[PDB]
Amino acid sequence: TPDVFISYRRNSGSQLASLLKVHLQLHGFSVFIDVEKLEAGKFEDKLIQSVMGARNFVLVLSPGALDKCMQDHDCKDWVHKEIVTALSCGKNIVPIIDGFEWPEPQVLPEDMQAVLTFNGIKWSHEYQEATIEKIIRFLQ
Ligand SMILES: Nc1ncnc2c1ncn2[C@@H]1O[C@H](COP(=O)(O)OP(=O)(O)OC[C@H]2O[C@@H]([n+]3ccc4c(I)cccc4c3)[C@H](O)[C@@H]2O)[C@@H](O)[C@H]1O
Numbered sequence: 001t002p003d004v005f006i007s008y009r010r011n012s013g014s015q016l017a018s019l020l021k022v023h024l025q026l027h028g029f030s031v032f033i034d035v036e037k038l039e040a041g042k043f044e045d046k047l048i049q050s051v052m053g054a055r056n057f058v059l060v061l062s063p064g065a066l067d068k069c070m071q072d073h074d075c076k077d078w079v080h081k082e083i084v085t086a087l088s089c090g091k092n093i094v095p096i097i098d099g100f101e102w103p104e105p106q107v108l109p110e111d112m113q114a115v116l117t118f119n120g121i122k123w124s125h126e127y128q129e130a131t132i133e134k135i136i137r138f139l140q
Helices: 010-026 043-053 078-088 110-117 128-138
Strands: 004-007 056-061 092-097
Touching (some): 004 010, 004 043, 004 078, 010 128, 056 078, 078 110
Parallel strands (some): 004 056, 056 092
16 A cells, blocks of 8 residues: 555646656655546545555645635545545645745634644755655655
């Protein structure tokens, strides 16, 4: 079962999410990203189970990636759902910052405000190898 779950906003972070997957697999990690490992069945159950199964939760914070979480108090947004699962389960959450603006916590639903308290890694286009090396040091 995967060591690492990658959560991302499809319309803005898909390329970086894919790049992270490639690098982490090259360094020996088993990685869940939906387009490679989400298979048949009711995707709500399968996605939550896949977050639960992975020790590490890598969150791709592209610009505006949490915008659709705002006021989503019924937890219908999928990045919101994945984050709440990771927080509840006490996962090793590793945010990756790629143009993300740090919001005031009160714009987010209470059940995910804690995601902002985890130390995030800045994605450097100029120093990608060093960024990847730092991500690997953060993983368990
Ligand atoms: N039965 C169906 N089969 C195939 N495609 C269906 C569908 N029903 C609806 N769509 C299509 O999917 C789109 C909504 O997905 P997107 O808007 O792009 O997602 P987001 O960027 O918000 O979230 C991305 C984050 O949530 C996770 N994720 C993974 C899989 C998901 C699936 I599968 C459906 C919906 C959300 C998902 C979210 C993923 O692991 C990542 O971390 C709609 O427009 C439909 O065209």
